Amino acid sequence: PFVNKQFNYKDPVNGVDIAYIKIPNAGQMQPVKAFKIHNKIWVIPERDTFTNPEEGDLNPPPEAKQVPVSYYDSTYLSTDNEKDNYLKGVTKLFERIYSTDLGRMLLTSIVRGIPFWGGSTIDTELKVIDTNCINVIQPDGSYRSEELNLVIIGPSADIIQFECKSFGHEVLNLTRNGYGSTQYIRFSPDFTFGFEESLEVDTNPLLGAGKFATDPAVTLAHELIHAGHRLYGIAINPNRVFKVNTNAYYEMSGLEVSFEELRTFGGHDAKFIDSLQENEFRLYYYNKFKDIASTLNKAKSIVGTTASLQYMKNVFKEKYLLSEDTSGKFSVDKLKFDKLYKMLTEIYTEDNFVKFFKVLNRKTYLNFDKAVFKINIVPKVNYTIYDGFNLRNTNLAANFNGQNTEINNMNFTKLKNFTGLF
């Protein structure tokens, strides 16, 4: 299993994989109970009022002001039972993802994608960037710094606004310079989205109530794919967008979708990014990798004592798949770079995960959500690692009946309709 231990929210802290921690949000905060579910990966069963000190208010704004696709509930994830269920739900989804070859590949890439040690001012020393770490309270009450790659945390005010967040740098654009940075994914396994089986209906803002439910494993995988891009510092600048001209409703509103999102979805959506620009990005990141290789060449000493210089240089040799000549200098091989870049951007996509999970899912990112449902994937009678909602040897096994909210209605409670509100 990906998660060797079946944590319970109330398990006593041990200061190792169950502990009170603080994140480097450049601000003050009371420690929060966190769980380390796998090497380099932690889960914080709390609403995220930490990564952005300006988004610490969960209370729903006036009914008069609150956009279309959004859902508020200041009380969600405030009780120990909810946190216990949250932990178990997130764990189950990691197992579902890991149970597929594609998921195993993605999670392996994520664990190997340690954020680069480029926090030093002297080019002759390798130093970690502290915002790619968390402070763990040890048994003696003292804090120790631990590097990590990924944190799954509850959503902020808008419960369904799932996304990847990471701490920036005063000068370096860590998610776009090949360095990478610790990724915090706002996510909840307790809700999901409703979509429509007919493409003409799903991509229309005035039609459909959301007959089918999105499998939460796909939603989490989508965020993990973004995390992968960001951990390897190859995310596409959000200002690079596609002026949607394939959907009259998007067009009439001049809506634009970032290339990063189209890439992440994959399939035909990825084709909206022309060859000219794809080549531009590819060369840009190849050069960034070259800079990382040269920085490693100049590294003559290492700061700290958490690992040897040789160990860390090797850690990044494996991450970026660099080559090493007779002398001992690192270089970026074109074939190896293209292979890794392609793996992270074309192999790891939402569309491919749908193929592996054998689930029904939106056929494109360019659609309109229909509704949000409350769900509970923890009980095996409701959802499993192997089949999600479409439980084998039951009436829900075929035709995605488990995702059909009308057939499997006991597993979904519609909380809000979005159709007609755009």
Partner: peptide
């Protein structure tokens, strides 16, 4: 992110 999910989008529209």
């Amino acid at each position: 992110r999910r989008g529209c």
